[PDB]
Each structure stands twice: as C-alpha cells, then as structure tokens.
C-alpha cells in the first residue's frame, strides 16, 4: 500500500 492500506 502507498502508506497504510490493505495488509
């Protein structure tokens, strides 16, 4: 993810 997204 660009940054915090789906794991």
């Amino acid at each position: 993810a660009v940054g915090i997204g789906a794991v």
Epitope: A1, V2, G3, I4, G5, V7
Partner: antibody, heavy 121, light 111 residues
C-alpha cells in the same frame, strides 16, 4: 485531494471524543483505506483504525477496539471518529489519512493537518 | 512497548551518506512491508517510502529504503541540511493485529 479535521479542542475525562474529517478533491466512496492516526506528546504515533471507502468495513487497533468507532457519511463526503471513555492518555494530535493512489507516479499519502485534542477536567 | 525500535537520535554531515535503521520482530518487518515517514517541526508526517523501497513522486532520489529478515533501513546519500527532521519506519504487526510506527529517529545535520 485534501483533508481536514474538526473537533472539540478539549474533552472531559470519561466523555467521548468526536472528530470529523472533510474531504475535498476526491470522493469518500472510493476504494481506499481512510485511517485515523494519533500522535501523542512525546511524538509517539498510533494507528487507531481505518475504514474502506467502498464497503465501509472497518478494522480497529485491538488496543482500542472497544472504545473506538470509525464511519462514513457519503452525503457530506465525510469521515468520523468516536473514542469513548477517554483519559489523559488520549490527549494527542489526531489526523485523517487516505492511503493514496496506487500508481507509478503517486504523490503518496494524504494527511490532514491534525487537530490537537487535550483531555482534561 | 515498542515492537519497532530505532536509534533515538542520528547525526551526519552535509554530503555524507547516512542510514537510519529499524529493528522489528518476525511478525511485522519479517513478513510485512515497511513505510518510511518524514516529519518536520509542526508538520504532518510526510510519506517517503512504501513497500520497503518505493519512492512516491516528488521524493528526492537521495532517499532509498531496504529491508531484510526483520530489519529495515533508510539511506540518505548526500545529506542536506534540508533533511533535518524526524524519521519513522512503519509496518503492520500480525501478533498485535494493528499497524505500528517505530520509536522515531531525530536526524540533525551538522555544519
């Protein structure tokens, strides 16, 4: 694609902190992870949880899962955070973040400016 | 309780090549992506690296990111005073079911 936070600068202990994030330049329904991030004094950063724009399914940091709720208002293009039973441990700066587009030339994340919430009697 | 720890402070001269390390456990860096965030005085964190090494557009090419096993690293080649900021690695912790941030490293540029 910008974001901004509204909310009471002060909240009383055991009461419920409520925050709003307004989004401009992009839709809140989009298939994105909208996270609430808090930064305590001492500059420690904590991820509270996120909500996915399309389904509205949410996932919370288990350390706070009971006290938290994150939701979406499609008509206002809005994101909302509620944290109950707050103590001095929740005085912090609060941001809303969207992960941002997954493309070769992305600008990256999108962060609000952050609203400082102080918990005090 | 920090599952991602970084040296609290790091110092380097202009032009020098410096690196900020991030030490994690098997359940976050060992198996998950790491992001690197930069934060200036009074500023929201600025995403610098995602998926261990990818730079978003606009990020200077002097920044590079690596990851192996359960450790990650951020490298500034050609240190600039413009780079004086706080740096955080960030990953996902499976054991704790939550996204986590490092202790942060305050980078100061001498000269």
């Amino acid at each position: 694609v910008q974001l901004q936070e509204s909310g009471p600068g002060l909240v009383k202990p055991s009461e419920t902190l409520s925050l709003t994030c307004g989004v401009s330049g992009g839709s809140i329904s989009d298939a994105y992870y909208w996270s609430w991030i808090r930064q305590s004094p001492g500059k420690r950063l904590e991820w509270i949880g996120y909500i996915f724009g399309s389904n509205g399914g949410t996932r919370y940091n288990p350390s706070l899962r009971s006290r938290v709720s994150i939701s979406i208002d499609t008509s206002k293009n809005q994101l909302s955070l509620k944290l109950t039973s707050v103590t001095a441990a929740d005085t912090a700066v609060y941001y809303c973040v969207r992960e941002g587009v997954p493309t070769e030339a992305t600008t990256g994340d999108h962060w609000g400016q952050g609203v400082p919430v102080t918990v005090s009697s | 309780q920090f599952v991602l720890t970084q040296p609290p402070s790091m110092s380097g001269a202009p032009g020098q090549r410096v690196t900020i390390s991030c030490t994690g456990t098997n359940s976050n860096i060992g198996v998950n992506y790491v992001q690197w965030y930069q934060q200036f005085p009074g500023t929201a964190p600025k995403l610098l690296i995602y998926e261990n090494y990818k730079r978003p557009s606009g990020i200077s090419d002097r920044f590079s990111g690596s990851q192996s096993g359960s450790s990650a690293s951020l490298t500034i080649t050609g240190l600039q005073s413009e780079d004086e900021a706080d740096y955080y690695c960030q990953s996902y912790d499976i054991s704790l079911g939550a996204h986590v941030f490092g202790s942060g490293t305050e980078l100061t540029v001498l000269g």
